[PDB]
Amino acid sequence: GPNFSGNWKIIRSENFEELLKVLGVNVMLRKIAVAAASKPAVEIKQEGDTFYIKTSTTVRTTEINFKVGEEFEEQTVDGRPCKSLVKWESENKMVCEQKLLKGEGPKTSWTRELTNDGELILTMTADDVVCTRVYVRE
Numbered sequence: 001g002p003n004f005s006g007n008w009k010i011i012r013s014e015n016f017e018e019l020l021k022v023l024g025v026n027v028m029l030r031k032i033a034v035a036a037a038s039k040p041a042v043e044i045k046q047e048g049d050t051f052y053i054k055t056s057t058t059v060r061t062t063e064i065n066f067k068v069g070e071e072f073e074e075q076t077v078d079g080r081p082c083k084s085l086v087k088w089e090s091e092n093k094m095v096c097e098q099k100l101l102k103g104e105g106p107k108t109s110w111t112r113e114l115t116n117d118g119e120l121i122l123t124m125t126a127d128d129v130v131c132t133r134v135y136v137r138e
């Protein structure tokens, strides 16, 4: 498949706030999240099926480490600890399902796809809401 490695820059975002709202994030925290996510830095180091992904804004940094096909810990988009599994849906697209570590909640998932034109699309899902974030490589 194509190499996801590099520094990625946001060019288009749909329904990030809508997604946080259906997850019950309060309006003050949603506005901070939308402002922060307006200029993120995404660093991906891909070694075959092994991924390091660092997502940084001024207010929040996540670092995840996963092998496609092995369970790992991360957080949901609204910052709840979860156990995740990634699988390849195609050469170009990984899909991830998240189970909360404690309690129940809505079913959350993400997908990351490297398009034929070099765009990285992240989709994040909860209930009927689909958030799409499109990046280009710096």
Ligand SMILES: *S(=O)(=O)Oc1ccc(C#Cc2ccc3c(c2)C(C)(C)CCN3C(=O)CCC(=O)O)cc1
Pocket: 010, 020, 025, 029, 030, 032, 033, 034, 036, 037, 040, 041, 042, 055, 057, 059, 060, 077, 078, 079, 122, 133
């Ligand atoms: S892309 O890869 O650029 O997409 C992307 C995904 C998520 C984010 C983000 C974010 C974010 C920023 C601030 C906060 C949050 C998320 C929460 C978890 C929803 C809570 C509100 N909030 C804060 O309170 C500040 C940070 C924190 O939780 O400690 C960026 C880019």
